[PDB]
Amino acid sequence: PLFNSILDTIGRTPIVRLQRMAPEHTSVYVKVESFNPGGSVADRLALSVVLDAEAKGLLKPGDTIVECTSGNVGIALAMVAAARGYRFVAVMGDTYSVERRKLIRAYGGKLVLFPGHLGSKGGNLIADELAEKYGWFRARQFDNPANPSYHRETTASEILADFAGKRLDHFVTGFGTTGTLTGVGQMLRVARPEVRVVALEPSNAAMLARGEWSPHQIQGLAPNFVPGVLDRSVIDDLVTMDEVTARDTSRRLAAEEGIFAGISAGATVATALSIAEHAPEGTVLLAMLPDTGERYLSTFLFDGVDEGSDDAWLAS
Amino acid sequence: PLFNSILDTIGRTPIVRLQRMAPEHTSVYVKVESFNPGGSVADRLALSVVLDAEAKGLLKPGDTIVECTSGNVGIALAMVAAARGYRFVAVMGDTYSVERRKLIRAYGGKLVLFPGHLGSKGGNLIADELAEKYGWFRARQFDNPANPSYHRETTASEILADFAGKRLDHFVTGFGTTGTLTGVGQMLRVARPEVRVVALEPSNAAMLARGEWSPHQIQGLAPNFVPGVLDRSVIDDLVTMDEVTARDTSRRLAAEEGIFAGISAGATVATALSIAEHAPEGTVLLAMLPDTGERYLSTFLFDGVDEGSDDAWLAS
Amino acid sequence: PLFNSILDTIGRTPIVRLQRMAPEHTSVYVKVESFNPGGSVADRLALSVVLDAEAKGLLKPGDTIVECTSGNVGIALAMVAAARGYRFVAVMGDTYSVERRKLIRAYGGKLVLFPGHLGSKGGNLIADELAEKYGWFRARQFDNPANPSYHRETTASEILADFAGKRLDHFVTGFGTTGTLTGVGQMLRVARPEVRVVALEPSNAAMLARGEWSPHQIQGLAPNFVPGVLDRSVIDDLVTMDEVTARDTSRRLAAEEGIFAGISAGATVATALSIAEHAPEGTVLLAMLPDTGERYLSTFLFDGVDEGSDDAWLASLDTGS
Amino acid sequence: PLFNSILDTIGRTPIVRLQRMAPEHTSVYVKVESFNPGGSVADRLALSVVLDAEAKGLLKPGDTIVECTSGNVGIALAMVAAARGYRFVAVMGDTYSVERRKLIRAYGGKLVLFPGHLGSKGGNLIADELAEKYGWFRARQFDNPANPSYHRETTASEILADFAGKRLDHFVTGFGTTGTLTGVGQMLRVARPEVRVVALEPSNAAMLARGEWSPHQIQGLAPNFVPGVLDRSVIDDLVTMDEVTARDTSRRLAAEEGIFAGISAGATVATALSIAEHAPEGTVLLAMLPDTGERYLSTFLFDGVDEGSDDAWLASLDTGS
Numbered sequence A, B: 001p002l003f004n005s006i007l008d009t010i011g012r013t014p015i016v017r018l019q020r021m022a023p024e025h026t027s028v029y030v031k032v033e034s035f036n037p038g039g040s041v042a043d044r045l046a047l048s049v050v051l052d053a054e055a056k057g058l059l060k061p062g063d064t065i066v067e068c069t070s071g072n073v074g075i076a077l078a079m080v081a082a083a084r085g086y087r088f089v090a091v092m093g094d095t096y097s098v099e100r101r102k103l104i105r106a107y108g109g110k111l112v113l114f115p116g117h118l119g120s121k122g123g124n125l126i127a128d129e130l131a132e133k134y135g136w137f138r139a140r141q142f143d144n145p146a147n148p149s150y151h152r153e154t155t156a157s158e159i160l161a162d163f164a165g166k167r168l169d170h171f172v173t174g175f176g177t178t179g180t181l182t183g184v185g186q187m188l189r190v191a192r193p194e195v196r197v198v199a200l201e202p203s204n205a206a207m208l209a210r211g212e213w214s215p216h217q218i219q220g221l222a223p224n225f226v227p228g229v230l231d232r233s234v235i236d237d238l239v240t241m242d243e244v245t246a247r248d249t250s251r252r253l254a255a256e257e258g259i260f261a262g263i264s265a266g267a268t269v270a271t272a273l274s275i276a277e278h279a280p281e282g283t284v285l286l287a288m289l290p291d292t293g294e295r296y297l298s299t300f301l302f303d304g305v306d307e308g309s310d311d312a313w314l315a316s
Numbered sequence C, D: 001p002l003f004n005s006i007l008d009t010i011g012r013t014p015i016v017r018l019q020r021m022a023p024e025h026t027s028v029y030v031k032v033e034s035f036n037p038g039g040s041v042a043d044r045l046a047l048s049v050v051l052d053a054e055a056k057g058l059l060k061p062g063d064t065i066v067e068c069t070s071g072n073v074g075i076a077l078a079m080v081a082a083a084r085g086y087r088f089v090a091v092m093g094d095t096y097s098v099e100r101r102k103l104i105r106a107y108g109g110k111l112v113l114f115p116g117h118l119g120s121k122g123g124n125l126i127a128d129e130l131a132e133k134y135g136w137f138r139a140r141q142f143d144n145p146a147n148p149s150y151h152r153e154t155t156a157s158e159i160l161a162d163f164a165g166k167r168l169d170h171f172v173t174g175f176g177t178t179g180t181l182t183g184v185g186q187m188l189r190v191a192r193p194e195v196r197v198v199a200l201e202p203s204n205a206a207m208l209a210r211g212e213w214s215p216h217q218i219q220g221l222a223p224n225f226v227p228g229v230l231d232r233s234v235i236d237d238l239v240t241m242d243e244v245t246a247r248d249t250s251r252r253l254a255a256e257e258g259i260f261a262g263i264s265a266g267a268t269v270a271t272a273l274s275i276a277e278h279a280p281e282g283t284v285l286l287a288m289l290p291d292t293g294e295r296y297l298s299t300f301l302f303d304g305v306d307e308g309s310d311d312a313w314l315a316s317l318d319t320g321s
Ligand SMILES: Cc1ncc(COP(=O)(O)O)c(/C=N/[C@@H](CONC(N)=O)C(=O)O)c1O
Pocket: A040, A042, A068, A069, A070, A071, A072, A073, A074, A120, A174, A175, A176, A177, A178, A179, A180, A181, A219, A220, A221, A222, A223, A224, A262, A264, A265, A290, A291
């Protein structure tokens, strides 16, 4: 049926099965969040927070939304603001991919950059001062309950519906705000307590597991602090994945499965594959693919990529 | 429900209503083909041709598919080949966006570039020689019946279903192979003969309307010849749209409606808006949005875009 | 997502594969129209005619709609009328199942019965006379272009979308108004001309094939005249099917596949199975199942059905019969 | 897309807004479980218990399933059995509608009737005795965790997805096994604790509220015992609803909204309308409609329904009464 707003297409993303990448004795499925109009799982948060704000009477047309983002939320919030009539200002580290900057501008969002080495803790402070200075609305994605709640009601509902009456042993996800991890983990806990909730962190930014943090290349993951929305109790397995393995796995997904996703997507799949390798027969795992690989053409995901004609190849 | 192959998510794209861009006395809807896994309407063709080929016994695993493309079909065919186990070689003009080249490489496709000024006629000749030389399978998108047929069965079926029992006066589309135009126009003709099928061409490459052709910036449209699959009779209104107006309209779609699409998408919407302006009250129009704007960050769609912090703006 | 009206759930019915009834070398799929809110394919026509009439300014709130029906259209129009604020009067043969009378009544419809043996030809005259006397709107299901048109746009679109990129050899359907056969048949002609369009008639009511008609038991099919909306050119195979075989096939569907459908439904499947029997390996067929079997409890579909306890069966177990 | 089995169409039922029955300052939505292939919410339990049993190695092809049911579960298990290759035996009170007996029979199920006045307590004993004597599998719908679990994963997920980002104040449902109330109630507790969970019982069978039971007419609800799967903690409002009001509300739904549902369906809506009457403006309520009204043709839902021609009404028109 026809849709009124493009915002009505958010959510209800497909879960597809990996055809060759999974170890023969297992089944690995992936939730493709790039089907979201904004091209990432951040669409869920963006809509949730704005709708909740409107309901709270904190958002009026023409108002300005300011937020510290690693990219995807800035894009999504910019999209929502363009569609619903709000202004948007993204506070983002200068090391995040240029695509994110362009996409944010594409939806008409403003852009405030800052030294990426300060991490999200630094950006949050900036976004906070700005809001205080100009009276802008703060989305506070790392502390806003509307973040994980939307995941409890949609992301969780999609996964549970799709696997109803079916076997499912592991759910793998990385975390930025931990909204996805918390919201889905809290529903899994009640509906399917047997499913192991696996939470990975970049090997070089293992905050929860090692109290460590350093800039990294798995954009979207590991802020330099523990987010307020996180319900630590939902985690069964806390593991790490290195950014190079993540990059290499995203590549495999594209060339071996026809699925082009981001670095974090390659991280979760790589983790899922690791568990699968030494898991019992029949084991079924689900990994989240947060965004499209399209906003990573300028990153290390394409190191070594040949943009010229294959005259050498053809030579053979 | 769960999906087996990512290829099972092709088609069934949303048709959304423009909230502010349409003249108050009208309704403009848009079919967002960027929801296709490959991010463009080309996914329909790619799958169709490969499945038809397999059925014909012309395609076996490991076989190599070669095709002359303006980009999107190369990406899609590369995607399908990665998922189904085929090799792919794209013949593409060197003037098409770098994103297309990267995306094709992302799915593991080979890349053969040639002087863009030769247009698709030149690329077709190249792809043909290569296939003859190495025995590769030729998709022949400009002449393959499987191209418009898939549009007759899906694209057309989605539009008709969504508007069943509803008013619809104009259907707007541009054309490359003319597969979309032909296939949907042929079904509209039978089911809703009253709907005007509007076919636009770039002002500077009006082949059908003026027998003219010149390189242009509306990537995906106007090859330098009349495609074999074209059923000229389905066209009611043949109009032109300039590439700058198309670019400006795509921008508006993004910043005013939250819809980020390609140049051709801005072209069709601009045409639809033009008709709407001087159309009777109640007039309902549908325009196709062929692909995501994400593969256009390096094109003129972003001329003048500021990639730096808004210190100037903040200054105020 | 949430629906505003119950009428927004009309259409988009599932097509499912038969798991054990089809010959091994073939595949038989069925379109389950019982999934429509009204319980049958009639919902598509009812909504279409009403919407069309509204856009043409022929219908206004409180207006009365009258139609001669074999049952399902009466049920559907009643449902649409109840949802949209209209009054409905059904003109139905007295031999159609009582479930039909009760369903029409449930939605608030009125009932005008007439001697069934007169066929729909007789019913249309009554419907026409009532309209002229009271000014009621006539759906004219046998001549209204809005009938086959909704099938070209929805029923046909769902079928083509589901089979896109897949093998489909035969499309099987019976006909009453022929709106289904004409609407789908015409779209199939343009997009998949290779598909064989098979239209069956009851063995005892081969009106189109031989100009024969007699009251029959495959409720919903074969009126005693050739409907105006019919485009005979879409038919590749015009066959017959006897009511008993149809009845038995409906029974088999419910007990062997868990699909409970009406008589006309058993008819189409029966025909499809007949073609599948002598068809080449790989042959794929699609059969229409117009309605739920639940409005046939009082029909010969349940002749011999035991409503009592299986005391005898239970005893048959203890022993060694 | 194409479906392999009819059982793959179970669940994902539409939720629609009532257009004229709700008080102006409120919004009442209803979950239409009739859209399930079996015609009711029972399909979710039937599939779940069977799938669970299969994964636990408790069910093998040709195995026999036995269950005491008020009807719908018998119909559904019969349907699943017919589709999956199982044998089914229903143990049902003799007072439940004959449509239930016929439907079970249609899918190939067996029927064991017993004096209705004994309630499901009496039926379970019979079911248990039969199983022990013949080794049949017991679905144990009142104690099987697979019941409420399928509701947490599907029914609740559909509700939450549809209302995500939207206002929802009350969730209304009655209960038989309480699987629906417990499964949905528990997920609502975690995701939307603000939503008021309203569970009603028949005025004459307030077993949970006052420990009272008497045979009643709201078929499907209130067994004469408190089910083991019940998690009483999910209930915020425990109310009653009389069968007549429920019956009248089902009538109103079909005639005023074009939605034809059973008695328990009329009950939930009635309760919801009652709460809506004195609720603040903007209040949004959701009511469960467990099944189609088509298996109630022989019940008091149709008391006073005229199966004859409206000759009198037609005459009433010509005159000036
Ligand atoms: C590609 C990708 N993968 C996984 C996640 C994590 O999702 P959440 O845990 O937030 O739910 C995100 C989050 N992206 C959010 C938060 O990232 N900010 C950080 N880490 O400081 C944003 O766009 O601002 C992501 O962009």
